[PDB]
Ligand binder design. Structure first.
Ligand SMILES: *[B]([O])([O-])[C]([C][C][O])[N]C(=O)[C]1[C][C](OC2=C3[C]=[C][C]=[C]C3=[C][C]=N2)[C]N1C(=O)[C]([N]C(=O)O[C]1[C][C][C][C]1)C([C])([C])[C]
Ligand SMILES: *[B]([O])([O-])[C]([C][C][O])[N]C(=O)[C]1[C][C](OC2=C3[C]=[C][C]=[C]C3=[C][C]=N2)[C]N1C(=O)[C]([N]C(=O)O[C]1[C][C][C][C]1)C([C])([C])[C]
Ligand SMILES: [Mg+2]
Ligand SMILES: [Mg+2]
Ligand SMILES: [Zn+2]
Ligand SMILES: [Zn+2]
Lengths: 16, 153, 21, 180
């Protein structure tokens, strides 16, 4: 089995 | 090209959180096991495994940035959920903190391996388990950060 | 003498967010 | 709280000069801290209570480039090393700290939040020292209380051999004094 990435979270809330 | 400190991760069974601190992408053993983490060059093996402390760490992936360990020692903490909710938490002991506002346990599902940050937003610990009366999460257990620095050494 | 100029910003008011896909 | 910051460049070296000279600036403004440049140097400017403050030793007596051309300072206090313009349309002001806490947090031109312990009116120490060069261009940035309220603006670094271990700053009080 392999651990996979489904999303990320930016703490500062920096936009695109 | 925005980079996140906190990754939302998944096995075949569970779905939980990881946190980059000091170049290493940590999470919980009870979620990760000894699995590798995926990369587009193929699997990458755990750099640290510490079955005692429920603690696993890989090399931080692409599109990630690390936090710095909290150095102000404040007792006012903030848990970050996997829904990017922020929960104020007051530090009891080394690895205990109590929610200034207790809430439904469903509100923290998928969030173990999330971080706990001080006022400065620096890393205080990873979140492990919920202290709770029936229905309602009331305090939290967390891996403290010094555990990480001394897993690193 | 020349005017002072804004060339960037720092934003504190931002709160943690899921990076959109 | 938690205090977290990010940084956005909005202008290039070329566009900065042209805008300096014309004094006319049509870029839209956001956030509480502005990154600002003269021709010589670059530093920080913090909005508190509808006024955009920064260090005098940075701005001297200059206007600020605005949508309507250059704007004169509202306040000038050479001795505080302090200067003020009306906050640019679209910025957000910080409010002065009133918890009177002694655990401060300094915001950096690189959008870092570094913890400071207060050791007097206008002096506090870094919990972990830094190269003095790390702080160059952060003059005029805010120190915050744990609540995210303004306690002071960063003025100068206390150092030896190029390692800063404490910071010297203009306390929020001095602002109020300067308004009166
Ligand atoms: B996470 O993977 O998504 C999940 C998020 C919480 O909703 N975590 C859990 O379900 C944890 C995992 C189990 O606990 C532990 C544990 C706890 C302490 C030290 C080491 C380890 C190692 C492995 N697993 C169960 N769990 C809980 O949150 C439970 N709470 C609990 O056990 O509380 C006590 C733990 C120490 C102090 C209180 C439940 C499921 C009952 C909420
Ligand atoms: B800024 O332009 O980007 C910059 C950011 C910080 O690195 N500011 C500086 O480098 C300041 C500017 C100079 O100091 C002053 C000053 C200081 C106090 C009161 C009034 C004024 C007025 C004009 N200029 C130098 N400086 C420093 O940080 C210096 N440190 C220093 O002077 O420390 C003593 C003064 C109070 C506490 C000790 C240097 C660069 C010499 C380390
Ligand atoms: Mg923020
Ligand atoms: Mg930042
Ligand atoms: Zn801290
Ligand atoms: Zn305060």
């Amino acid at each position: 089995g392999s651990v996979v990435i489904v999303g990320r979270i930016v703490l500062s809330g920096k936009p695109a | 090209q925005v980079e996140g400190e906190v990754q939302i991760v998944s096995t075949a069974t569970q779905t939980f959180l990881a946190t980059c601190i000091n170049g290493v992408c940590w999470t919980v053993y009870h979620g990760a096991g000894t699995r590798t983490i995926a990369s587009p060059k193929g699997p990458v093996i755990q750099m640290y495994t510490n079955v005692d402390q429920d603690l696993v760490g890989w090399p931080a992936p692409q599109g990630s940035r690390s936090l710095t360990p909290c150095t102000c020692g404040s007792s006012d903490l903030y848990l970050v959920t996997r829904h990017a909710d922020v929960i104020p938490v007051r530090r009891r002991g080394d690895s205990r903190g109590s929610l200034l506002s207790p809430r439904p346990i469903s509100y923290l599902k998928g969030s173990s391996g999330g971080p706990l940050l001080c006022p400065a937003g620096h890393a205080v610990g990873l979140f492990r388990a919920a202290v709770c009366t029936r229905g309602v999460a009331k305090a939290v257990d967390f891996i403290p950060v010094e555990n990480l620095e001394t897993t690193m050494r």
